[PDB]
Scaffold this active site. Structure first.
Site, mmCIF file in Angstrom:
data_model
loop_
_atom_site.group_PDB
_atom_site.id
_atom_site.type_symbol
_atom_site.label_atom_id
_atom_site.label_comp_id
_atom_site.label_asym_id
_atom_site.label_seq_id
_atom_site.Cartn_x
_atom_site.Cartn_y
_atom_site.Cartn_z
ATOM 1 C CG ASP A 31 -3.509 -0.232 -3.471
ATOM 2 O OD1 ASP A 31 -4.922 -0.738 -2.662
ATOM 3 O OD2 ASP A 31 -3.047 0.071 -1.330
ATOM 4 C CG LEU A 56 19.476 5.823 -14.202
ATOM 5 C CD1 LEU A 56 20.274 7.533 -14.636
ATOM 6 C CD2 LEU A 56 18.517 6.175 -16.414
ATOM 7 C CG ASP A 112 26.647 1.319 -16.246
ATOM 8 O OD1 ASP A 112 26.101 2.383 -14.997
ATOM 9 O OD2 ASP A 112 27.318 0.379 -15.643
ATOM 10 C CG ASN A 167 3.298 -1.600 3.241
ATOM 11 O OD1 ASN A 167 2.686 -0.478 3.227
ATOM 12 N ND2 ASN A 167 2.208 -2.604 3.903
ATOM 13 C CB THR A 227 -1.009 -0.568 1.281
ATOM 14 O OG1 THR A 227 -2.160 -1.063 1.129
ATOM 15 C CG2 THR A 227 -1.676 1.500 1.017
ATOM 16 C CG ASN A 256 25.670 3.360 -11.488
ATOM 17 O OD1 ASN A 256 24.613 1.989 -12.436
ATOM 18 N ND2 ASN A 256 25.210 4.068 -11.233
ATOM 19 C CG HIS A 291 -1.711 -6.592 -0.834
ATOM 20 N ND1 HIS A 291 -0.635 -5.781 -1.263
ATOM 21 C CD2 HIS A 291 -2.485 -6.837 -0.029
ATOM 22 C CE1 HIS A 291 -0.779 -5.167 -0.195
ATOM 23 N NE2 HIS A 291 -2.086 -5.495 0.952
ATOM 24 C CG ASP A 339 21.904 0.026 -14.805
ATOM 25 O OD1 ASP A 339 23.305 1.123 -14.456
ATOM 26 O OD2 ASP A 339 20.898 -0.170 -14.109
#
Ligand SMILES: *[C@@H]1O[C@H](CO)[C@@H](O[C@@H]2O[C@H](CO)[C@@H](O[C@@H]3O[C@H](CO[C@H]4O[C@H](CO[C@H]5O[C@H](CO)[C@@H](O)[C@H](O)[C@@H]5O)[C@@H](O)[C@H](O[C@H]5O[C@H](CO)[C@@H](O)[C@H](O)[C@@H]5O[C@H]5O[C@H](CO)[C@@H](O)[C@H](O)[C@@H]5O)[C@@H]4O)[C@@H](O)[C@H](O[C@H]4O[C@H](CO)[C@@H](O)[C@H](O)[C@@H]4O[C@H]4O[C@H](CO)[C@@H](O)[C@H](O)[C@@H]4O)[C@@H]3O)[C@H](O)[C@H]2NC(C)=O)[C@H](O)[C@H]1NC(C)=O
Ligand SMILES: O=C(OCc1cc(Cl)cc(Cl)c1)N1CC[C@@H]2CN(C(=O)c3ccc4[nH]nnc4c3)C[C@@H]2CC1
Ligand SMILES: [Ca+2]
Ligand SMILES: [Ca+2]
Ligand SMILES: [Cl-]
Ligand code: NA
Ligand SMILES: [Zn+2]
Ligand SMILES: [Zn+2]
Length: 809
Positions: free
Chosen positions: A308, A693, A695, A180, A159, A689, A424, A687
Site C-alpha cells: 500500500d 478538470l 473549467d 486514516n 493505509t 474549482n 509514512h 481549474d
C-alpha cells in the site's frame, strides 16, 4: 446489540454478511464484536499447529486439529499446506524451477482463473532487493512473473487511502477516504482508526472490486481480515474457499498482512528487527503457493503481490510544532503527523483567518521542515483537493519529519512514547514511500520487468483479469496492457468534438483598437512568398510532431500557423489552448530586442472582437503578460515578429513571469541540449474549482481588469523527445520520452523560500515539485495529445501516465 448465542457450526468464514438477530461468523465479526459464542472454538482452531509432520501422515481425521494430514484432506480442501511435501514426497513450490505458464491449467469446473491479491502493509519497494536473501518465495514470484521496480502509491501515503484506491481505481479525493482520520463537515462526523464510525457506508465512495465483481455475477472472497486471525488461518481459509463447489466458489480473494508496516513503525524501515517480519511474510507466501500446488491451482490462479506504501525513518526529535509559529495555536485543530491539515477549532470563531495562519507558517525558519499550502495550490499531481473532508489548509511535511500542534501532543497521548522509528504519509513521489508490485500467473507475462506505474491503474487490470467491466475510475485503461499476456483492453482514441477553423488574412490593422503598439513598420517576392507558405502551414510537420491535439468538448477555435510554432487559439478564452513548437539540439537562444520590449501585434487572421487588448493589461496594476511561444527561441529576426502577436500572449503575474521567462530563456534550450531536441506544447489551465478538470467559461473567477480575458490558474508544458536520444526529437523512429509540468499561476513566489535569489537557484526546484503526467493535463484542458504517432495506442497511454519524479534510484 448482538444476540450471540446462535452458532458458527457450518458457517465459519461465511461469505454473506448476516444482519441481526444473528450472531456473525465472517472474517470481520471480531472487529464489530459480533461473533457467535463458538467462533473461536469452531473457526479459530489451533490444535497441533500449522504443519504436517511424518507421524501425522495418514492419520484418522480429527476435527479439533488446525489443519489435516489425513488421506481425505485434499478432497476436503483442508490439508496443512505442507501435507504433500511431508506425506507424499512432493517438493515445495519454491524449490521448483519456473516454467512459463502460457495458458491457465485449471481443474474442471473453473470458468476463469481466480485472482488472489496478496497485499502487504508498509512493504517498501527497496525490500525486494535488500531483503532478497531472506525472501525466496517472493523472489521466485518476482523473477518468474511480471514485476515493476516499484509502484507509486496515492497521497497521502497512508493505509486506508491506499488500500481503498487499490480496490477502486480512484484518487482519495474521489473515493472519500482522504486520510486514516477525517472530519466530514456535512455529516458533522469523524472517522477514526479506533471505533465504530469508520464502518458506516457513507464514508466509502466509488465502487470497490468486490462490489464490481458481485454486480456482474462474479463471487468475491471477503477483503478485510480481523487482526487476531493468524496469517496461517487466513491462508487456510482462502484455500478452503477455493475448494468450494463451482456455483459457490469465489473468483477473487484478498490476503492482508499487517507486516512489515507494524514492525517498521517500531524499528524503522531497515532496523535489524525487520529481517524476521520479512522472513515470516515470505513463509506465508510459501504456504499459499504450496497450498495452491496441492490443489493443482498453482498454474491456474493469478497472484498479485502488492503493497500500500513504503516506510521512512522518522523519530520524535524530528517534529516541528505549530506552537513555535502561531500565537493563536488553541484556535486551530490539526490533523498531525507526516502531513498536516488545519481547520478552525470553532466554526463560531469569526477571528480565525486562514490567510494569516498561512503567512505565519511561511518561510519562518531557514531549515523549516514543512510548507503550508491552501489545498488548491498543492501540486496538481497529488489530486488532493476536491473533497469537503480535505481541510483548506494543508502542510506538506518533509520526508523524515512530523508536524504537531504543541510539544505535549508528542510525549503525551498518541505520538508513541518516542518509541517509534518509522512512519509514512509523505508526498507520493518520495522514494521511501514507493511500494511493490508483482503479478504472477497465466494472464501475466513471463520473466518480464515493466516500468514503475501508479496504483490507481490496478483496478482496471484486476477487472481485465476477472472479465469485469470496471466502474468509472482514474486509471487510464490500456496503460497497463504491457503487463498482460492476454485480456488486454483495446481502447479507441476519444472522438474529436470540435473541428478547428483555419482562418486566413481577414482584418486590416486599423480595425484593431486594442491600445497595443509595435515598432514593426520596417520593410521582395522570395521572402513574401515564404512568409505566406509559413502562415499556410509549410513548417507544421517540424513543430507539430504528433498531430494536432484533439479538442474533446464543444468550442470555437482556430488553428494558426507560423514559422516557428503552431497554436490552437480559443475564440472563447481569447488565447491559445495549446502552442506547439520544436527546438533542435543546436538551436540559438536570442533576446527580445530593445525596440520590441513592449511590442504587441494584432493578428490579422483573428477578429478584434476575439482578441486580447493591451489597454486592459495597462489598467490592471497586478497583471502583466507573457508569451506561450518564447521570442527567445525564434529561428530568425524576421520570424521573431510572430512571437509578439496578440494571439500568442497570455495573462501572467510579474512574480510568475520570473518563473516562465527562466523556463523559456534557459531551461527549454538546456533540455534540447540534453535530449537531442525537444518538442514543447504549452498552454494555460483553468481549474478554479480545483476538481482536476477543465473549467467551463462560467467557472472562471478572475479576469484581467475591465476585460473578458480569463486568468489561468496554471500553465502547463509537455516536453517530448526520442527515448533513443541519439535520434533527434524531430526524426525519432521508436518510443518517446516525455516530462511535463503544471505550474501554479501565483501572484507571489512565497512557495519558494529562496526566491529572492537568482532564478537559477529556485525555479527548477519549483518545476520539479510541479511535475505532471500528460494525462493530468488532458483532464485539465479537455485535449487529447499524441494522436498521430507510429506507436501502438497502448504504448502511448503508458507514456501519457508517465511521471518524471526527479528522485534518484
Ligand atoms: C476520477 O474518476 C472519477 C470517476 O469517474 C471522476 O469522478 C466523477 O466526476 C464527475 C464530474 O465531477 C462526477 O459527475 C457528477 O456526478 C453527480 C452524481 O454523483 C452521484 O452519483 C455517482 C454515480 O453513482 C453510481 O455509479 C455507478 C456507475 O456509474 C452506478 O452503477 C451506481 O448506481 C452508483 O451509485 C456517485 O459516484 C457520486 O459519488 C460522489 O458523491 C458521493 C456523495 O457525495 C461520495 O460518497 C463519493 O465518494 C463521490 O464523491 C466525489 O464526487 C463528488 C461529485 O459528484 C465530489 O463532490 C466529492 O468531493 C468527491 O470528489 C454521487 O453519489 C452529478 O450530480 C453531477 O452533475 C451536476 O454537475 C454537472 C457539472 O458540474 C452538471 O452539468 C449537471 O447537470 C449537474 O449539475 C447540477 O448540480 C450542480 C452541482 O450540484 C449544480 O450546481 C447545478 O446547478 C445543477 O443542478 C456530476 O455529473 C462523478 O460523480 C464523479 N464520480 C466519483 C466516484 O467521484 C473524477 O472526475 C476523476 N478525476 C479526475 C481528475 O479525472
Ligand atoms: O484487512 C484489511 O484490508 C485488506 C484490504 C486489501 C485490499 Cl487490496 C483492499 C482493501 Cl480495501 C482492503 N484491513 C484490516 C486492518 C485495518 C486496520 N488498519 C490499521 O489499524 C493500520 C495499519 C497500518 C497503519 N500504519 N499507520 N497507521 C496504521 C493503521 C489497517 C486496516 C486495513 C483494512
Ligand atoms: Ca499591468
Ligand atoms: Ca475545474
Ligand atoms: Cl517574486
Ligand atoms: Na519566496
Ligand atoms: Zn499501510
Ligand atoms: Zn503504518
Amino acid at each position: 446489540w448482538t444476540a450471540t448465542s446462535g452458532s458458527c457450526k457450518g458457517r465459519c468464514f461465511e461469505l454473506q454478511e448476516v444482519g441481526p438477530p444473528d450472531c456473525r461468523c465472517d472474517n470481520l465479526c471480531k472487529s464489530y464484536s459480533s461473533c457467535c459464542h463458538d467462533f473461536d472454538e469452531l473457526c479459530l482452531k489451533t490444535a497441533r499447529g500449522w504443519e504436517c509432520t511424518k507421524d501425522r501422515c495418514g492419520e484418522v481425521r480429527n476435527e479439533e486439529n488446525a489443519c489435516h494430514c489425513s488421506e481425505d484432506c485434499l478432497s476436503r480442501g483442508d490439508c496443512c499446506t505442507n501435507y504433500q511435501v511431508v506425506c507424499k514426497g512432493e517438493s515445495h513450490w519454491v524449490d521448483d524451477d519456473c516454467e512459463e505458464i502460457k495458458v491457465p491449467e485449471c481443474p474442471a469446473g473453473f470458468v476463469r482463473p481466480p485472482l488472489i491479491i496478496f497485499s502487504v502493509d508498509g512493504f517498501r519497494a527497496s525490500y525486494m532487493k535488500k531483503g532478497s536473501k531472506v525472501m525466496p518465495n517472493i523472489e521466485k514470484l518476482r523473477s518468474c512473473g511480471t514485476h515493476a521496480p516499484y509502484m507509486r502509491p496515492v497521497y497521502p501515503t497512508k493505509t486506508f487511502p491506499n488500500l481503498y484506491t487499490l480496490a477502486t481505481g480512484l484518487y482519495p479525493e474521489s473515493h472519500g477516504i482522504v486520510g486514516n482520520s477525517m472530519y466530514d463537515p456535512v455529516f458533522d462526523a469523524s472517522f477514526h482508526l479506533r471505533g465504530r464510525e469508520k464502518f458506516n457506508h457513507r464514508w466509502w465512495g466509488g465502487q470497490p472490486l468486490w462490489i464490481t465483481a458481485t454486480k456482474q455475477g462474479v463471487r468475491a472472497g471477503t477483503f478485510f481480515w480481523s487482526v487476531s486471525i493468524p496469517h496461517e488461518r487466513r491462508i487456510l481459509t482462502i484455500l478452503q474457499w477455493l475448494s468450494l463447489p463451482d456455483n459457490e466458489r469465489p473468483s477473487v480473494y484478498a490476503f492482508y498482512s499487517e507486516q512489515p508496516d507494524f514492525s517498521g513503525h517500531k524499528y524503522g524501515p531497515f532496523g535489524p528487527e525487520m529481517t524476521n517480519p520479512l522472513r515470516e511474510i515470505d513463509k506465508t507466501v510459501g504456504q499459499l503457493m504450496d497450498g495452491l500446488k496441492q490443489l493443482r491451482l498453482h498454474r491456474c490462479v493469478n497472484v498479485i503481490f502488492v503493497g500500500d506504501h513504503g516506510m521512512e525513518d522518522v523519530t520524535c526529535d524530528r517534529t516541528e510544532f505549530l506552537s513555535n509559529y502561531l500565537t493563536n495555536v488553541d484556535d486551530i485543530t490539526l490533523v498531525p503527523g507526516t502531513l498536516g491539515r488545519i481547520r478552525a477549532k470553532s466554526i463560531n470563531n469569526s477571528k480565525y483567518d486562514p490567510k494569516t495562519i498561512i503567512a505565519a507558517l511561511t518561510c519562518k525558519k531557514p531549515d523549516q521542515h514543512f510548507k503550508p499550502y491552501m489545498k488548491q495550490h498543492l501540486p496538481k499531481r497529488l489530486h488532493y483537493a476536491n473533497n469537503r473532508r480535505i481541510e483548506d489548509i494543508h502542510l506538506l511535511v518533509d520526508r523524515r519529519w512530523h508536524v504537531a500542534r504543541k510539544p505535549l501532543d508528542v510525549y503525551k497521548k498518541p505520538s508513541g512514547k518516542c518509541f517509534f522509528q518509522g512512519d509514512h504519509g509523505f508526498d507520493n513521489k518520495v522514494n521511501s514511500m514507493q511500494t511493490v508490485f508483482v503479478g504472477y500467473g497465466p494472464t501475466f507475462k513471463y520473466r518480464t520487468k515493466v516500468p514503475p506505474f501508479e496504483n490507481i491503474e490496478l483496478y482496471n487490470v484486476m477487472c481485465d483479469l476477472l472479465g469485469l467491466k470496471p466502474a468509472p475510475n482514474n486509471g487510464t485503461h490500456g496503460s497497463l496492457n504491457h503487463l498482460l499476456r492476454t485480456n488486454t483492453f483495446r481502447p479507441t482514441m476519444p472522438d474529436e468534438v470540435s473541428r478547428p477553423n483555419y482562418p486566413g488574412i481577414m482584418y486590416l490593422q486599423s480595425e484593431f483598437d486594442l491600445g497595443c503598439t509595435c515598432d514593426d513598420k520596417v520593410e521582395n517576392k522570395l521572402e513574401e512568398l515564404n512568409k505566406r507558405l509559413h502562415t499556410k502551414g509549410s513548417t507544421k510537420e517540424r513543430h507539430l510532431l504528433y498531430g494536432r491535439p484533439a479538442v474533446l468538448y464543444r468550442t470555437s477555435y482556430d488553428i494558426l500557423y507560423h514559422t516557428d510554432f503552431e497554436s490552437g487559439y480559443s475564440e472563447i478564452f481569447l488565447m491559445p489552448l495549446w502552442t506547439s513548437y520544436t527546438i533542435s539540439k543546436q538551436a540559438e537562444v536570442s533576446s527580445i530586442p530593445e525596440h520590441l520590449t513592449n511590442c504587441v501585434r494584432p493578428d490579422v487572421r483573428v477578429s478584434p472582437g476575439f482578441s486580447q487588448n493591451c489597454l486592459a493589461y495597462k489598467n490592471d496594476k497586478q497583471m502583466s503578460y507573457g508569451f506561450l511561444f518564447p521570442p527567445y527561441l525564434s529561428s530568425s529576426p524576421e520570424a521573431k515578429y510572430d512571437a509578439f502577436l496578440v494571439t500568442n500572449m497570455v495573462p501572467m503575474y510579474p512574480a510568475f513571469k520570473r518563473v516562465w521567462a527562466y523556463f523559456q530563456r534557459v531551461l527549454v534550450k538546456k533540455y534540447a541540449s540534453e535530449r537531442n531536441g525537444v518538442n514543447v506544447i504549452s498552454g494555460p489551465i483553468f481549474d478554479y474549482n480545483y476538481d482536476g478538470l477543465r473549467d467551463t467559461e462560467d467557472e472562471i473567477k478572475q479576469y484581467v481588469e475591465g476585460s473578458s480575458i480569463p486568468v489561468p490558474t496554471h500553465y502547463y508544458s509537455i516536453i517530448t523527445s526520442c527515448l533513443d536520444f541519439t535520434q533527434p526529437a524531430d526524426k525519432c523512429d521508436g518510443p518517446l520520452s516525455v516530462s511535463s509540468f503544471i505550474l501554479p499561476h501565483r501572484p507571489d513566489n512565497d512557495e519558494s523560500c529562496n526566491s529572492s535569489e537568482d532564478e537559477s537557484k529556485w525555479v527548477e526546484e519549483l518545476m520539479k515539485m510541479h511535475t505532471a503526467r500528460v494525462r493530468d493535463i488532458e483532464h485539465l484542458t479537455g485535449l487529447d495529445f499524441y494522436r498521430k504517432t507510429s506507436r501502438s495506442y497502448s504504448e502511448i497511454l503508458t507514456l501519457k501516465t508517465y511521471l518524471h519524479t526527479y528522485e534518484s534510484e
